[PDB]
Amino acid sequence: QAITRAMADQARTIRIPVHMVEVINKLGRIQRELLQDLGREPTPEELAKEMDITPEKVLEIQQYAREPISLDQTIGDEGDSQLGDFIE
């Protein structure tokens, strides 16, 4: 319990409430189970059927789950300049 609560409260650059992290992890887990079972990836409507909630909220959860990237990671094929040198 302590480890999972701390993961939810501290693992992400943008804090996500545990009530939303739980649904994100559950969605990912059962979606990978569905992919393994069915042989293809599950579509958002199919995943919403298991979430017992609407595909709009499924998509909102999906776009919420994304994490930021570093402004200083090298973007070029070689190491020449940082991503921060491309942002207006």
Add this chain to the structure above:
DNA sequence: TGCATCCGTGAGTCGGGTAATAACGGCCTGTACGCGTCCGTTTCCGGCACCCCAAATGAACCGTCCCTGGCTCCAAGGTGAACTCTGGGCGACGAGTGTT
């Protein structure tokens, strides 16, 4: 007391974006939203107290911008004659020519 052993700077110039996990009820509250009701406002229907206001309805009316009246005093239309061409009419004279 060297002595290996890290250990800390290079090394120039103007195509984009790639992922994981057991987690699950149950209670609280909190800020935002959703109901029902009541009161200040405000905005007009038609009323005056009358405010009167006024363009439209009778005058003159006098100067003036139109009519009628007569009068000229002149310059244009009517009345002459000639003449210098303008044109036709008259006449004579001369060689190229119809003919046996």
